[PDB]
Design a protein around this ligand. Structure first.
Ligand code: NA
Length: 600
């Protein structure tokens, strides 16, 4: 089970990648600028030029590695990003609002959840989790499962210029496995194993009760160290290095760096507990004066079990993508109601030892860093413009009856929504899984196609100028284009990863940065004003995340049979963006598109 037999990620032909690149950008940049890029690309791709030299090096790389883009992609997409993890990088999954009449109901839920995680982790450790299969026209095929084995064994260490993804060095003989429980910004070690025994749901309940009792005590409250994990990666690397000066912090950091996951017992919030309100809390906790410090962003999974019923999971994106995260969470949720009745179962034981509180040595430097982080987090809280928009007019069954793909249909709509608001399309990003190949993560589908441009123009720039007969046909060619790019991407023939490798190979072999990658056209192509992804679920929950550029949007959608849930974000600091206006534009676009299909 090392996936050595899975197909290796393909390396696309050079001329095809360059040709698709120019075609994708033409309608997105000024005529004058485009003409220069054509010359730049021609020089780059000429016989015996830089491009062919690099391509030859890339093929060499493909033979020597399991996946030629892994290292490059992991650094470019996550580890090199200097922005704070909250909102900018770490996505959150929000569960249904829970009903807790008192603390004990909240703790039983948490206890049941932890128990489910130990069971799920048991299936993994013994390789009993069934292999995911991809449905195909003539057959199916196994998908890479590497992401699952990083769910509970990963930690993201901050670095001054580049972060590090650490794979828990489980080379240490059997020892006390544990989870970290965050309460009132205090962190506690909760051992899940004592002797050859695994704690029962009842025991966990008993242990959590002691934690809530000790954390509630104001007499011995420690500083909210978790706040430091919410800052810029370079700031946190500096603050963390200051912490390492004392043996006490060194021990506490180690415990956190070797836990299975975090369980955050958040305090009650104010206001109506609407989908939007609950999302805001999972995304950033509401700042350090609410739940923003009751966190530790370097850890992959942080389960949140709030007193008022707000529950969910915030996760660090570098080790795995949303599809795998959702499969894990669904398996966990379903088993919390199993089945148972018876008786118881549981166991418881004794008498078990009390859960231990992690200590910290706080100096004047650290105190300075805490105040900086606090202000920094508030800016993020105030800057996030977010909304959970539920489109209930229709969903998958309607789109399917029109013989169109629900994903492509929704992507075309998003292009229409953007056009009717800005009268132009922009470089768009849509996550596409390449798990068919060894260590496969994702590549990009560029939905802002020439065909989509033609469709949106006829839909809003006509004003009764043309028949529904034509509009209906332009939509067809646009849908065909989406489907085509989608198949190109999931089969490893897209352009993003290919260009990324050529660029990095050039950085490592060329004394001076190539004209090809300094070209404004190229830089613009990688500024995704519209960042999107589909995260479908079979139950009451949804995933959400922030924009990847200051003047951008983040759009995550969940397609249901009779409805579609849209999670939209943007920054208040950018006057030209508004999450509510864009959501309503998406709605309008879906209604306009249905009326068009009805006119057939
Ligand atoms: Na804005």
């Amino acid at each position: 089970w090392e996936e050595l037999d899975l197909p290796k990620l393909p390396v696309p032909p050079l001329q095809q990648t360059l040709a698709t690149y120019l075609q994708c950008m033409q309608h997105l940049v000024p005529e004058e600028q485009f003409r220069k890029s054509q010359a730049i690309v021609k020089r780059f791709g000429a016989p015996g030029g830089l491009g062919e030299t690099l391509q030859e090096k890339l093929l060499e790389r493909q033979e020597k590695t399991a996946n030629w883009v892994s290292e490059y992609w992991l650094n470019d997409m996550y580890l090199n990003n200097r922005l704070a993890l909250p909102v900018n990088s770490s996505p959150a999954v929000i569960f249904a609002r829970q009903h807790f009449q008192d603390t004990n109901d909240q703790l039983r839920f948490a206890a049941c959840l932890i128990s489910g995680v130990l069971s799920y982790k048991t299936l993994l450790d013994s390789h009993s989790l069934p292999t995911d299969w991809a449905k195909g026209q003539l057959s199916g095929q196994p998908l890479c499962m590497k992401q699952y084995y990083r769910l509970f064994s990963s930690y993201r260490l901050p670095g001054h210029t580049q972060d590090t993804l650490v794979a828990q060095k489980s080379s240490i003989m059997p020892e006390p496995e544990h989870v970290i429980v965050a309460c009132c910004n205090q962190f506690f070690v909760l051992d899940v194993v004592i002797n050859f025994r695994r704690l029962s749901e009842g025991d966990l309940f008993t242990q959590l009760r002691k934690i809530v009792k000790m954390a509630s005590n104001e007499d011995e409250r420690l500083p909210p160290i978790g706040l430091l994990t919410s800052d810029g990666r370079s700031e946190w690397a500096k603050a963390r290095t200051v912490l390492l000066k004392d043996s006490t912090n060194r021990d506490s950091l180690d415990m956190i760096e070797r836990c299975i996951c975090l369980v955050c017992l958040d305090g009650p919030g104010t206001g109506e507990l609407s989908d939007t309100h609950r999302a805001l809390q999972l995304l950033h906790g509401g700042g350090c004066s609410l739940n923003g410090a009751n966190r530790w962003y370097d850890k992959s999974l942080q389960f949140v079990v709030g007193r008022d019923g707000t529950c969910g999971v915030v996760c660090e994106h570098s080790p795995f993508d949303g599809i795998v995260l959702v499969q894990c969470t669904e398996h966990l949720l379903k088993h919390m109601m199993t089945s148972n009745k018876k008786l118881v179962r549981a166991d418881s034981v004794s008498e078990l030892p009390a859960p231990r509180r992690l200590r910290w040595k706080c100096s004047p430097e650290t105190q300075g860093h805490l105040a900086s982080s606090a202000e920094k987090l508030q800016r993020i809280v105030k800057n996030l413009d977010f909304i959970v928009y539920k489109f209930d007019n229709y969903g998958k069954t309607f789109i399917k009856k029109q013989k169109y793909s629900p994903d492509g249909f929704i992507q075309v709509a998003l292009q229409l929504a953007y056009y009717r608001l800005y009268q132009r399309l922009v470089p768009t990003y849509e996550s596409a899984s390449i798990r068919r190949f060894q260590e496969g993560r994702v590549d990009n589908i560029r939905s802002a196609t020439p065909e989509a441009l033609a469709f949106v123009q006829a839909m809003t720039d006509h004003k009764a100028a043309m028949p529904a007969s034509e509009k209906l046909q332009l939509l067809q060619t646009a849908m065909q284009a989406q489907t085509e790019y989608t198949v190109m991407a999931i089969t490893g023939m897209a352009i993003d990863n290919h260009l990324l490798a050529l660029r990095e190979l050039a950085r490592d072999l060329c004394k001076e940065p190539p004209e090809m990658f300094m070209d404004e056209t190229y830089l613009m192509s990688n500024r995704f004003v519209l960042s999107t992804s589909q995260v479908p679920t079979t139950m009451e929950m949804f995933c959400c995340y922030g924009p990847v550029v200051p003047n951008g949007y983040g759009a995550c959608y969940n397609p249901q049979p009779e409805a579609i849930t849209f999670c939209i974000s943007s920054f208040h600091s950018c006057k030209e963006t508004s999450s509510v206006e864009f959501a309503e534009a998406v709605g309008a676009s879906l209604v306009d598109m249905r009326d068009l299909c009805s006119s057939r």
